């Protein structure tokens, strides 16, 4: 009855009915990686001139990144450390136009390389969700204040430089503190973004940071909608 | 037998059941339709044996899962090194690198 | 859908015209035999019968035999 | 939904790329391995095979051995 | 619906944070532990494990023991 029906589903991913190429499966896996973020965040990125590219050229000898600094060749990954640019396979370049170049891989099997694209995407739309009046939103400031008190979400999300700098200030109370550490305040949003949209990492965010999970959940079902509207109305 | 006094006892095989979990009510119930002679030949062919008598001269036979490179299901197991097998199967440690 | 008469889990055109099994990261992947892609990797070309659940009539299917889901 | 081939209650990317089991208030939570949190607690980083119900082919699954819901 | 992992008929917040059992007219009610009310009645404050159907691993659930629906 349901025996062969569930035996078929238990091998429904295993058998491959028509294969016919090799680099065509990386293209499909990249597209199905990308199309499972919602439709709204892509419009939020494309409002300010966002660009998503699929190449097989590794990100060293690509034609559009041949002329770059050393402080952008040494930028930080999701884990905090700098990545060698021979090793980096996904990069967002926004020196004048926000452009993100994705090298294709087999992303459905590889849910570790599938998190760096989510991290750089959350890096992309970061400030335009954080900033409203050219300043960090005070609701997000209350959020960072509440997360630094909890001893678990603190060392989940913040980089160690942030925690070893904040107790020197013992209180994110200064107007200069936000203006001096905006990269960390952006990184804390992009890390929670990548934890939210990697579909086996949501329960990490739910239990280790329950009030950051609710911030991203409120952003998920209509916050993107409102920010896309308020950007597209001023888009003319 | 009364002249030479030699009579010993061999052990050919051992029957016996497995008791598995029950998710419904947490209890553990012996299933009487499955013995270890359906299980132990499958352990003896996908693992690797390590015997060790460094604890007061007693042999402690253990078995760690290891990859067989000519079987498509068995090539899905994680790569197991001798240091990791000695560390997780018996209880070695490396407090100074050694 | 893809027809499968014998109910062994591998479709019929694969059993007639060849197939192979390999793992990719840690997951097995049953595939049709493409000539100049698998022959340089050194896999095998299995062919079977699309009407029998087990082509040698023994109690192990073609799928369990080539996949390893068998009595070891 | 999340893929789970072997049907042992733990997804494929966690079994391949590392996981652990942690309690928070009184409830156990199986989670992917994060070194910034699971090293200070002194936990273990497990890796199993995503297409076997029990990687050592014994009758206790990979879920049960790490969770403790097993024969005591 | 309230969560109940172990399926012993009593919610997890009550098992972790305290509960008690008392009859009102001729009917049994299971209640969260309120020190302002339940202490003067002379009742008892139970706690148990929200993951185990029976906290002492004997074949009587935590509901059956405190309620009276047990082998006498
Ligand atoms: Ca067939
Ligand atoms: Ca067949
Ligand atoms: Ca699994
Ligand atoms: Ca498994
Ligand atoms: Ca309960
Ligand atoms: Ca209980």
Swiss-Prot record, chain A:
Record note on domains: The N-terminal region contains the ATLF domain responsible for binding to the cleaved form of protective antigen (PA-63). The C-terminal region contains the calmodulin-dependent activation domain and the catalytic site. This region is composed of three globular domains: CA, CB and a helical domain connected to CA by a linker. The active site lies at the interface of CA and CB. The metal ion is coordinated by residues from CA; calmodulin probably binds in a multistep fashion first to residues in CA and then to residues present in the linker and the helical domain.
Residues of the full protein shown: 53 to 288 of 800
Family (UniProt): Belongs to the adenylyl cyclase class-2 family.
Role: Edema factor (EF), which constitutes one of the three proteins composing the anthrax toxin, causes edema in the host. Acts as a calmodulin-dependent adenylyl cyclase by converting ATP to cAMP, leading to dramatic elevation of intracellular cAMP levels in the host, thereby causing edema. EF is not toxic by itself and only acts as an edema factor when associated with protective antigen (PA) to form the edema toxin (EdTx). Required for the survival of germinated spores within macrophages at the early stages of infection.
Protein name, as recorded: Calmodulin-sensitive adenylate cyclase
Transmembrane segments: none
Subcellular location: Secreted; Host cytoplasm, Host cytosol
Complex formation: Interacts (via ATLF domain) with the cleaved form of protective antigen (PA-63) anthrax toxin; interaction is required for EF translocation into the host cytoplasm.
Gene behind this protein: cya
Swiss-Prot record, chain B:
Localization terms from the record: Host cell membrane; Host endosome membrane
Effect of residue 95 to S: In strain: BA1024
Effect of residue 73 to A: Decrease in heptamerization capability
Coiled-coil regions listed in the entry: none
Assembly mode: Homooligomer; homooligomerizes to form homoheptamers (PA-63(7)) or homooctamers (PA-63(8)). PA-63(7) or PA-63(8) form ring-shaped oligomers that are in a pre-pore conformation, which do not penetrate the host membrane. PA-63(8) displays an enhanced stability, suggesting that this form circulates in the blood to reach and exert toxicity even in distant tissues. Interacts with lethal factor (LF) and edema factor (EF); can bind LF and EF simultaneously and interaction takes place following homooligomerization on the host cell membrane.
Cited function: Mature form that oligomerizes and forms a pore to translocate the enzymatic toxin components edema factor (EF) and lethal factor (LF) into the host cytosol. Following attachment to host cell receptors and cleavage by FURIN, homooligomerizes to form ring-shaped oligomers that are in a pre-pore conformation, and associates with EF and LF. Toxin-leaded complexes are then endocytosed in a clathrin-dependent process, followed by a conformational change of oligomerized PA-63 from the pre-pore to pore state, which is triggered by the low pH in the endosome.
Domain comment (free text): To pass through this hydrophobic restriction, substrate proteins LF and EF need to be unfolded prior to translocation. The alpha-clamp consists in an amphipathic cleft between two adjacent PA protomers, which assists the unfolding of substrate proteins LF and EF. The alpha-clamp binds non-specifically to alpha-helices of substrate proteins LF and EF.
Descriptive protein name: Protective antigen PA-63
Species name: Bacillus anthracis
Gene: pagA
Swiss-Prot record, chains C, D, E:
Chain positions recorded as Ca(2+) 2 binding sites: 6, 8, 15, 49, 52, 62
Record note on what altering residue 34 to S does: Abolished interaction with LF
Membrane topology note: Multi-pass membrane protein
Site (Alpha-clamp): 5, 14, 63
Location relative to the cell: Host cell membrane; Host endosome membrane
Spans annotated as Alpha-clamp: 29-37
Stated consequence of mutating residue 27 to S: Abolished interaction with LF
Impact when changing residue 53 to A: No effect on LF-binding ability and as toxic as the wild-type
Outcome (variant: residue 37 to A): Decrease in the ability to bind to LF and partially toxic at high concentrations
Assembly, per entry: Homooligomer; homooligomerizes to form homoheptamers (PA-63(7)) or homooctamers (PA-63(8)). PA-63(7) or PA-63(8) form ring-shaped oligomers that are in a pre-pore conformation, which do not penetrate the host membrane. PA-63(8) displays an enhanced stability, suggesting that this form circulates in the blood to reach and exert toxicity even in distant tissues. Interacts with lethal factor (LF) and edema factor (EF); can bind LF and EF simultaneously and interaction takes place following homooligomerization on the host cell membrane.
Free-text note on domains in this protein's UniProt record: To pass through this hydrophobic restriction, substrate proteins LF and EF need to be unfolded prior to translocation. The alpha-clamp consists in an amphipathic cleft between two adjacent PA protomers, which assists the unfolding of substrate proteins LF and EF. The alpha-clamp binds non-specifically to alpha-helices of substrate proteins LF and EF.
Name this protein carries in UniProt: Protective antigen PA-63
UniProt lineage: Bacteria, Bacillati, Bacillota, Bacilli, Bacillales
């Amino acid at each position: 009855k349901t025996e062969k029906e569930k035996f078929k589903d238990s091998i429904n991913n295993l058998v491959k009915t028509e294969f016919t190429n090799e680099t065509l499966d990386k293209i499909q896996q990249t597209q199905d990686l990308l199309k499972k973020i919602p439709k709204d965040v892509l419009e939020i990125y494309s409002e300010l001139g966002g660009e998503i590219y699929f190449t097989d050229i590794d990100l060293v000898e690509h034609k559009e990144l041949q002329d770059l600094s050393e402080e952008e060749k040494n930028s930080m990954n999701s884990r905090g450390e700098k990545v060698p640019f021979a090793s980096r396979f996904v990069f967002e370049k926004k020196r004048e136009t926000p452009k993100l170049i994705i090298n294709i891989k087999d992303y459905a099997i590889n849910s570790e390389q599938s998190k760096e694209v989510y991290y750089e995407i959350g890096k992309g739309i970061s400030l335009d969700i954080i900033s409203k009046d050219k300043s960090l939103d005070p609701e997000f400031l209350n959020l960072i204040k509440s997360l630094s008190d909890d001893s678990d979400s603190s060392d989940l999300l913040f980089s160690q430089k942030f925690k070893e700098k904040l107790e020197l200030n013992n209180k994110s109370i200064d107007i200069n503190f936000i203006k001096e550490n905006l990269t960390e305040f952006q990184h804390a949003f992009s890390l929670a973004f990548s934890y939210y949209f990697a579909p086996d990492h949501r329960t990490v965010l739910e239990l280790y940071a329950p009030d950051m999970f609710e911030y991203m959940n409120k952003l998920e079902k209509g916050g993107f909608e409102k920010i896309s509207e308020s950007l597209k109305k001023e888009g003319v | 037998l009364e002249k030479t006094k030699q009579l010993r006892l061999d052990t050919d095989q051992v029957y016996g059941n497995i008791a598995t979990y029950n998710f419904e009510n947490g209890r553990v119930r012996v299933d009487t339709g499955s013995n270890w002679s359906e299980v132990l030949p499958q352990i003896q062919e996908t693992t690797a044996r390590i015997i060790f008598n460094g604890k007061d001269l007693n042999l402690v036979e253990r078995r760690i899962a290891a990859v067989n490179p000519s079987d498509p299901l068995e090539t899905t197991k994680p790569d197991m090194t001798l240091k990791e097998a000695l560390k997780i199967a018996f209880g070695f440690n490396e407090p100074n690198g050694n | 859908t893809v027809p499968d008469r014998d109910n062994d889990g591998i479709p019929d055109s694969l059993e007639v015209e060849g197939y192979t099994v390999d793992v990719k990261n840690k997951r097995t992947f049953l595939s049709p035999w493409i000539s100049n892609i698998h022959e340089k990797k050194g896999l095998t070309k299995y062919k079977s019968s699309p009407e029998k659940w087990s082509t040698a009539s023994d109690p192990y299917s073609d799928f369990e035999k080539v996949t390893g889901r068998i009595d070891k």
